[PDB]
Amino acid sequence: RPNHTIYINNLNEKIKKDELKKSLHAIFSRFGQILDILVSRSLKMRGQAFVIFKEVSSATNALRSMQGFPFYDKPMRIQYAKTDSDIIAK
RNA sequence: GGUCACGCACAGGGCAAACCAUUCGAAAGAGUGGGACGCAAAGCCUCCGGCCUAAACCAUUGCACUCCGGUAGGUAGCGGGGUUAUCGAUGG
Ligand SMILES: Nc1nc2c(ncn2[C@@H]2O[C@@H]3COP(=O)(O)O[C@H]4[C@@H](O)[C@H](n5cnc6c(=O)[nH]c(N)nc65)O[C@@H]4COP(=O)(O)O[C@H]3[C@H]2O)c(=O)[nH]1
Ligand SMILES: [Mg+2]
Ligand SMILES: [Mg+2]
């Protein structure tokens, strides 16, 4: 069930999108070349983030290394992406 | 002459985008002064659609790459609608 993208939920929702990406990017750049980080704060898509990696191995690396990680007072709930991104599926 | 539409003007004007200064605001943004991009209602009003904001409240653990909660505020120079008003092409 591995994927280029990893799905994080259970995040402090009152963190601004602009800032939020960077906070993850600094934490997650260390595993591979991140193509893009998708973050929204709409009713459905808040408190959660998608991180797209260059390598699938790098997404696996990030997943098994930081599960439950205390991030903004909250544990990081990471799981694989069920479906790839529109930028990958091509 | 009203009145209701119309804008090809005349004459008298009026308002003031951006930007800057300053104040308020969490922000969008607004106030004031300077400034003029434009505007025949660019006068005034959030009732209706859009767009902008997200500090606090309230709900949501939620799988996206169209965008989307209530709540609240903003935009009348985003339309729509409302309401008042000016000049008057041998004007219609
Ligand atoms: N008195 C009067 N005259 C009218 C009216 N409608 C049309 N006109 C005449 O027609 C010209 C052009 O009007 P416009 O195409 O709406 O274009 C206008 C308009 O967009 C703008 N403007 C001037 N005054 C006002 C105003 O009080 N309100 C608004 N919204 N726009 C204005 O400047 C442009 C040129 O205006 P002008 O040099 O005065 O020249 C005007 C004026 O001579 C009206 O309701 N009243
Ligand atoms: Mg004139
Ligand atoms: Mg509205």
PDB file of all heavy atoms in Angstrom, chain B residues 46 49-50 74-75, ligand 3:
ATOM      1  P     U B  46     -26.234  48.868   5.477  1.00  0.00           P
ATOM      2  OP1   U B  46     -26.138  48.805   6.951  1.00  0.00           O
ATOM      3  OP2   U B  46     -24.984  48.978   4.684  1.00  0.00           O
ATOM      4  O5'   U B  46     -27.054  47.598   4.955  1.00  0.00           O
ATOM      5  C5'   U B  46     -26.542  46.309   5.189  1.00  0.00           C
ATOM      6  C4'   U B  46     -27.293  45.293   4.350  1.00  0.00           C
ATOM      7  O4'   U B  46     -26.915  45.382   2.958  1.00  0.00           O
ATOM      8  C3'   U B  46     -27.027  43.840   4.694  1.00  0.00           C
ATOM      9  O3'   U B  46     -28.111  43.075   4.210  1.00  0.00           O
ATOM     10  C2'   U B  46     -25.759  43.551   3.913  1.00  0.00           C
ATOM     11  O2'   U B  46     -25.597  42.182   3.635  1.00  0.00           O
ATOM     12  C1'   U B  46     -26.060  44.303   2.626  1.00  0.00           C
ATOM     13  N1    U B  46     -24.862  44.883   1.985  1.00  0.00           N
ATOM     14  C2    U B  46     -24.607  44.556   0.676  1.00  0.00           C
ATOM     15  O2    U B  46     -25.313  43.808   0.027  1.00  0.00           O
ATOM     16  N3    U B  46     -23.481  45.141   0.154  1.00  0.00           N
ATOM     17  C4    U B  46     -22.611  46.005   0.801  1.00  0.00           C
ATOM     18  O4    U B  46     -21.636  46.454   0.201  1.00  0.00           O
ATOM     19  C5    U B  46     -22.950  46.299   2.172  1.00  0.00           C
ATOM     20  C6    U B  46     -24.041  45.737   2.698  1.00  0.00           C
ATOM     21  P     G B  49     -28.250  34.811  -1.452  1.00  0.00           P
ATOM     22  OP1   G B  49     -28.422  33.391  -1.057  1.00  0.00           O
ATOM     23  OP2   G B  49     -27.625  35.778  -0.517  1.00  0.00           O
ATOM     24  O5'   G B  49     -27.426  34.919  -2.817  1.00  0.00           O
ATOM     25  C5'   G B  49     -27.522  33.902  -3.801  1.00  0.00           C
ATOM     26  C4'   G B  49     -26.710  34.269  -5.027  1.00  0.00           C
ATOM     27  O4'   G B  49     -27.035  35.624  -5.453  1.00  0.00           O
ATOM     28  C3'   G B  49     -25.203  34.345  -4.830  1.00  0.00           C
ATOM     29  O3'   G B  49     -24.562  33.075  -4.697  1.00  0.00           O
ATOM     30  C2'   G B  49     -24.839  35.093  -6.111  1.00  0.00           C
ATOM     31  O2'   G B  49     -24.955  34.309  -7.282  1.00  0.00           O
ATOM     32  C1'   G B  49     -25.893  36.200  -6.069  1.00  0.00           C
ATOM     33  N9    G B  49     -25.389  37.334  -5.291  1.00  0.00           N
ATOM     34  C8    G B  49     -25.712  37.690  -4.001  1.00  0.00           C
ATOM     35  N7    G B  49     -25.074  38.748  -3.578  1.00  0.00           N
ATOM     36  C5    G B  49     -24.267  39.113  -4.651  1.00  0.00           C
ATOM     37  C6    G B  49     -23.341  40.180  -4.794  1.00  0.00           C
ATOM     38  O6    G B  49     -23.042  41.046  -3.964  1.00  0.00           O
ATOM     39  N1    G B  49     -22.727  40.201  -6.046  1.00  0.00           N
ATOM     40  C2    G B  49     -22.975  39.291  -7.045  1.00  0.00           C
ATOM     41  N2    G B  49     -22.300  39.450  -8.189  1.00  0.00           N
ATOM     42  N3    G B  49     -23.835  38.286  -6.926  1.00  0.00           N
ATOM     43  C4    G B  49     -24.445  38.252  -5.709  1.00  0.00           C
ATOM     44  P     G B  50     -23.305  32.923  -3.705  1.00  0.00           P
ATOM     45  OP1   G B  50     -23.004  31.481  -3.568  1.00  0.00           O
ATOM     46  OP2   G B  50     -23.562  33.722  -2.487  1.00  0.00           O
ATOM     47  O5'   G B  50     -22.103  33.638  -4.483  1.00  0.00           O
ATOM     48  C5'   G B  50     -21.646  33.170  -5.747  1.00  0.00           C
ATOM     49  C4'   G B  50     -20.717  34.179  -6.401  1.00  0.00           C
ATOM     50  O4'   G B  50     -21.332  35.494  -6.484  1.00  0.00           O
ATOM     51  C3'   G B  50     -19.425  34.443  -5.648  1.00  0.00           C
ATOM     52  O3'   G B  50     -18.497  33.413  -5.907  1.00  0.00           O
ATOM     53  C2'   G B  50     -19.001  35.778  -6.245  1.00  0.00           C
ATOM     54  O2'   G B  50     -18.435  35.671  -7.538  1.00  0.00           O
ATOM     55  C1'   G B  50     -20.346  36.497  -6.297  1.00  0.00           C
ATOM     56  N9    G B  50     -20.629  37.240  -5.066  1.00  0.00           N
ATOM     57  C8    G B  50     -21.584  36.931  -4.129  1.00  0.00           C
ATOM     58  N7    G B  50     -21.615  37.762  -3.126  1.00  0.00           N
ATOM     59  C5    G B  50     -20.621  38.686  -3.409  1.00  0.00           C
ATOM     60  C6    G B  50     -20.197  39.824  -2.673  1.00  0.00           C
ATOM     61  O6    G B  50     -20.631  40.248  -1.592  1.00  0.00           O
ATOM     62  N1    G B  50     -19.153  40.493  -3.307  1.00  0.00           N
ATOM     63  C2    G B  50     -18.592  40.110  -4.502  1.00  0.00           C
ATOM     64  N2    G B  50     -17.600  40.882  -4.959  1.00  0.00           N
ATOM     65  N3    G B  50     -18.981  39.051  -5.202  1.00  0.00           N
ATOM     66  C4    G B  50     -20.000  38.381  -4.601  1.00  0.00           C
ATOM     67  P     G B  74     -18.608  45.656   8.572  1.00  0.00           P
ATOM     68  OP1   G B  74     -18.454  47.049   9.051  1.00  0.00           O
ATOM     69  OP2   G B  74     -19.963  45.092   8.390  1.00  0.00           O
ATOM     70  O5'   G B  74     -17.818  45.445   7.200  1.00  0.00           O
ATOM     71  C5'   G B  74     -16.489  45.925   7.133  1.00  0.00           C
ATOM     72  C4'   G B  74     -15.766  45.476   5.879  1.00  0.00           C
ATOM     73  O4'   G B  74     -15.760  44.036   5.755  1.00  0.00           O
ATOM     74  C3'   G B  74     -16.385  45.917   4.570  1.00  0.00           C
ATOM     75  O3'   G B  74     -16.126  47.292   4.376  1.00  0.00           O
ATOM     76  C2'   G B  74     -15.611  45.023   3.612  1.00  0.00           C
ATOM     77  O2'   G B  74     -14.285  45.468   3.416  1.00  0.00           O
ATOM     78  C1'   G B  74     -15.597  43.709   4.386  1.00  0.00           C
ATOM     79  N9    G B  74     -16.621  42.723   4.028  1.00  0.00           N
ATOM     80  C8    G B  74     -17.679  42.318   4.809  1.00  0.00           C
ATOM     81  N7    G B  74     -18.429  41.415   4.250  1.00  0.00           N
ATOM     82  C5    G B  74     -17.829  41.193   3.021  1.00  0.00           C
ATOM     83  C6    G B  74     -18.200  40.303   1.980  1.00  0.00           C
ATOM     84  O6    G B  74     -19.168  39.522   1.964  1.00  0.00           O
ATOM     85  N1    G B  74     -17.321  40.389   0.889  1.00  0.00           N
ATOM     86  C2    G B  74     -16.224  41.228   0.829  1.00  0.00           C
ATOM     87  N2    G B  74     -15.488  41.181  -0.286  1.00  0.00           N
ATOM     88  N3    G B  74     -15.864  42.059   1.803  1.00  0.00           N
ATOM     89  C4    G B  74     -16.710  41.991   2.865  1.00  0.00           C
ATOM     90  P     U B  75     -17.151  48.157   3.518  1.00  0.00           P
ATOM     91  OP1   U B  75     -16.767  49.581   3.633  1.00  0.00           O
ATOM     92  OP2   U B  75     -18.521  47.747   3.886  1.00  0.00           O
ATOM     93  O5'   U B  75     -16.855  47.649   2.029  1.00  0.00           O
ATOM     94  C5'   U B  75     -15.628  47.956   1.359  1.00  0.00           C
ATOM     95  C4'   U B  75     -15.568  47.195   0.049  1.00  0.00           C
ATOM     96  O4'   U B  75     -15.765  45.789   0.316  1.00  0.00           O
ATOM     97  C3'   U B  75     -16.699  47.544  -0.900  1.00  0.00           C
ATOM     98  O3'   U B  75     -16.308  48.612  -1.742  1.00  0.00           O
ATOM     99  C2'   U B  75     -16.945  46.263  -1.692  1.00  0.00           C
ATOM    100  O2'   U B  75     -16.200  46.162  -2.888  1.00  0.00           O
ATOM    101  C1'   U B  75     -16.497  45.177  -0.728  1.00  0.00           C
ATOM    102  N1    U B  75     -17.659  44.407  -0.196  1.00  0.00           N
ATOM    103  C2    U B  75     -18.176  43.371  -0.960  1.00  0.00           C
ATOM    104  O2    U B  75     -17.732  43.044  -2.048  1.00  0.00           O
ATOM    105  N3    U B  75     -19.245  42.713  -0.399  1.00  0.00           N
ATOM    106  C4    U B  75     -19.839  42.990   0.820  1.00  0.00           C
ATOM    107  O4    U B  75     -20.791  42.315   1.189  1.00  0.00           O
ATOM    108  C5    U B  75     -19.254  44.081   1.559  1.00  0.00           C
ATOM    109  C6    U B  75     -18.210  44.737   1.033  1.00  0.00           C
TER     110        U B  75
HETATM  111 MG    MG C   3     -23.526  39.663   0.473  1.00  0.00          MG
END
